[PDB]
Amino acid sequence: AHMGIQRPTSTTTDKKEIKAYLKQVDKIKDDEEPIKTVGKKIAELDEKKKKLTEDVNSKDTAVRGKAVKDLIKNADDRLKEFEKEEDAIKKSEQDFKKADNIDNDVKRKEVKQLDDVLKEKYKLHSDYAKAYKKAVNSEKTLFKYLNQNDATQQGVNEKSKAIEQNYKKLKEVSDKYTKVLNKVQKEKQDVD
């Protein structure tokens, strides 16, 4: 060019645009940090739950009754804490939709693909949240059954199998979600 003048090429300008895109996606990911705190708080609650294992079968009726009532409260507490994760993902998805201008058609398709995988992330989280709530609620159902007169082993077993099945399902969906979080990073590597 005259005087060796240099001004931005479509490639440089696309880079700028991809940078701004990947930044909006990372700001949203940053703002999900509270989900980590939820996980820690639920883990603490899970440890407290395990520590009622002896008491739930206590021969001291008062110790047993307190353990059962504490187990009900603990299921409520885990569900309440999990609401914060649900709310965070809701916030993240709302910010997502707001986050071409890429001239390069090859690169523009890579971007649409990252967007589609992020869309799949939000959908799979909804499935995961449903499965987690179903599981914790099915624990609560067993504990309520213990909090009335005349509970039997047969009844306990029948409610226990449902908990087991719910956890099998939660594993299937949790695995799928972890997979999608990985696919999100793979698409980012290509896009960048």
Side-chain angles (χ1 to χ4, degrees), residues 55-69 146-147:
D55 283 357
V56 78
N57 293 338
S58 180
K59 305 188 314 191
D60 180 332
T61 65
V63 171
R64 187 191 282 207
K66 183 179 186 299
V68 168
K69 294 172 190 301
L146 304 176
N147 196 40

Coordinates of all heavy atoms in Angstrom, one line a residue, residues 55-69 146-147:
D55 N -28.6 -42.3 64.8 CA -29.8 -41.8 65.6 C -31.1 -42.2 65.0 O -32.1 -42.5 65.7 CB -29.7 -40.3 65.8 CG -28.7 -39.9 66.9 OD1 -28.1 -40.8 67.5 OD2 -28.6 -38.7 67.1
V56 N -31.2 -42.4 63.7 CA -32.4 -42.7 63.0 C -33.0 -44.0 63.5 O -34.2 -44.3 63.3 CB -32.4 -42.6 61.5 CG1 -31.7 -43.7 60.8 CG2 -33.8 -42.4 60.9
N57 N -32.1 -44.9 64.0 CA -32.6 -46.2 64.5 C -32.4 -46.3 66.0 O -32.4 -47.4 66.6 CB -31.8 -47.3 63.9 CG -32.1 -47.5 62.4 OD1 -33.1 -47.1 61.9 ND2 -31.2 -48.1 61.7
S58 N -32.3 -45.2 66.7 CA -32.1 -45.2 68.2 C -33.2 -45.8 68.9 O -34.4 -45.7 68.6 CB -31.9 -43.7 68.7 OG -31.7 -43.7 70.1
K59 N -32.9 -46.5 70.0 CA -33.9 -47.1 70.9 C -34.5 -46.1 71.8 O -35.5 -46.3 72.4 CB -33.3 -48.3 71.7 CG -32.7 -49.4 70.8 CD -32.3 -50.7 71.6 CE -31.5 -50.3 72.9 NZ -30.9 -51.5 73.5
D60 N -33.8 -44.9 71.9 CA -34.3 -43.8 72.7 C -35.3 -43.1 71.8 O -34.9 -42.5 70.8 CB -33.1 -42.9 73.1 CG -33.6 -41.7 73.9 OD1 -34.8 -41.2 73.7 OD2 -32.9 -41.2 74.8
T61 N -36.6 -43.2 72.1 CA -37.6 -42.6 71.2 C -37.4 -41.1 71.0 O -37.8 -40.6 69.9 CB -39.1 -42.9 71.8 OG1 -39.3 -42.2 73.0 CG2 -39.3 -44.3 71.9
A62 N -36.9 -40.4 72.0 CA -36.6 -39.0 71.8 C -35.5 -38.7 70.8 O -35.6 -37.8 70.0 CB -36.4 -38.3 73.1
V63 N -34.4 -39.5 70.9 CA -33.3 -39.4 70.0 C -33.7 -39.7 68.6 O -33.4 -39.0 67.6 CB -32.1 -40.2 70.5 CG1 -31.0 -40.2 69.4 CG2 -31.5 -39.7 71.8
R64 N -34.4 -40.8 68.5 CA -34.9 -41.2 67.1 C -35.9 -40.1 66.5 O -35.7 -39.8 65.4 CB -35.7 -42.5 67.3 CG -36.1 -43.1 65.9 CD -37.0 -44.3 66.1 NE -36.2 -45.5 66.5 CZ -36.6 -46.7 66.2 NH1 -37.8 -47.0 65.6 NH2 -35.8 -47.7 66.6
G65 N -36.8 -39.6 67.3 CA -37.8 -38.7 66.8 C -37.1 -37.4 66.4 O -37.4 -36.8 65.4
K66 N -36.1 -36.9 67.2 CA -35.3 -35.7 66.8 C -34.6 -36.0 65.5 O -34.5 -35.1 64.6 CB -34.4 -35.3 67.9 CG -33.7 -34.0 67.5 CD -32.7 -33.4 68.5 CE -32.2 -32.1 68.2 NZ -31.3 -32.1 66.9
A67 N -34.0 -37.2 65.3 CA -33.2 -37.5 64.1 C -34.2 -37.4 62.9 O -33.8 -36.8 61.8 CB -32.6 -38.8 64.2
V68 N -35.4 -38.0 63.0 CA -36.3 -38.0 61.9 C -36.7 -36.6 61.6 O -36.7 -36.2 60.4 CB -37.6 -38.8 62.3 CG1 -38.6 -38.6 61.3 CG2 -37.2 -40.3 62.3
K69 N -37.0 -35.8 62.6 CA -37.4 -34.4 62.3 C -36.2 -33.6 61.7 O -36.4 -32.7 60.8 CB -37.9 -33.7 63.6 CG -39.2 -34.4 64.0 CD -39.6 -33.9 65.4 CE -40.8 -34.7 66.0 NZ -41.9 -34.7 65.0
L146 N -41.4 -41.9 58.3 CA -40.9 -42.3 59.6 C -41.5 -41.5 60.8 O -41.4 -41.9 61.9 CB -39.4 -42.2 59.7 CG -38.6 -42.9 58.6 CD1 -37.1 -42.6 58.7 CD2 -38.8 -44.4 58.8
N147 N -42.0 -40.2 60.5 CA -42.5 -39.2 61.5 C -43.9 -39.4 61.8 O -44.6 -38.5 62.4 CB -42.2 -37.8 60.9 CG -42.3 -36.7 62.0 OD1 -41.9 -36.9 63.1 ND2 -42.9 -35.6 61.7

